[PDB]
């Protein structure tokens, strides 16, 4: 599909057997999801942006479907205010910016 | 252009007569640049990101050229980790996401 940018580019994803709303974010290196109790091994990580850093849990090899397009990779879980799909998964679904 | 996302979508912009590098950021409502001088009046504002809230200077109706495409709009200046072009200007240059 083609997503315009008049509003926040929010789409539906499926992760860990849940459907969620998430923001397609070309400015994010990584995918960061709001607090959820995913099974699996994880390691601590700190990620930054405007305002500073937050502590997150890094889970690897997690299947994530984005508007019906399958992806699998690293997901970060922590106290982000919005679910963010970053470049690590956007590349896997063949997402481009176009103008 | 069509810009893929295997690398950060960094582009050259011209603003206040000076060249800068900025990230095309679909996850940002607003355009936020690192500390620099811009001509004209500004208003104090606060914005939020993944780490919390910061204080910025809001400059209205600022011309910005982004990869040769012209925008004129709001530019916030403050302690962002990287220069970001947000949706307020991405829409002006006709940018969409496609997959």
Curated annotation (Swiss-Prot), chains A, B:
The active site is at 25 (for protease activity). It comes from the Viruses. Residues 20-89 form the Peptidase A2 domain. Residues 1-5, 49-55, 88-99 are annotated as: Dimerization of protease. Disulfide bonds: none annotated. Homodimer, whose active site consists of two apposed aspartic acid residues. Aspartyl protease that mediates proteolytic cleavages of Gag and Gag-Pol polyproteins during or shortly after the release of the virion from the plasma membrane. Cleavages take place as an ordered, step-wise cascade to yield mature proteins. This process is called maturation. Displays maximal activity during the budding process just prior to particle release from the cell. Also cleaves Nef and Vif, probably concomitantly with viral structural proteins on maturation of virus particles. Hydrolyzes host EIF4GI and PABP1 in order to shut off the capped cellular mRNA translation. This is Protease. It comes from Human immunodeficiency virus type 1 group M subtype B (isolate ARV2/SF2) (HIV-1). The gene is gag-pol. The chain holds residues 491 to 589 of 1437 of the full protein.
């Amino acid at each position: 599909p083609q997503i315009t940018l008049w509003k926040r580019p929010l789409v539906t994803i499926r992760i860990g057997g849940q459907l969620k709303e998430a923001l397609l974010d070309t400015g994010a290196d990584d995918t960061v999801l709001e607090e959820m109790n995913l099974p699996g091994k994880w390691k601590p990580k700190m990620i930054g942006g405007i305002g500073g850093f937050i502590k997150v849990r890094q889970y690897d090899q997690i299947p994530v479907e984005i508007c019906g397009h399958k992806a699998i990779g690293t997901v970060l879980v922590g106290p982000t205010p919005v679910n963010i799909i970053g470049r690590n998964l956007l590349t896997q679904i063949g997402c481009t910016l176009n103008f």
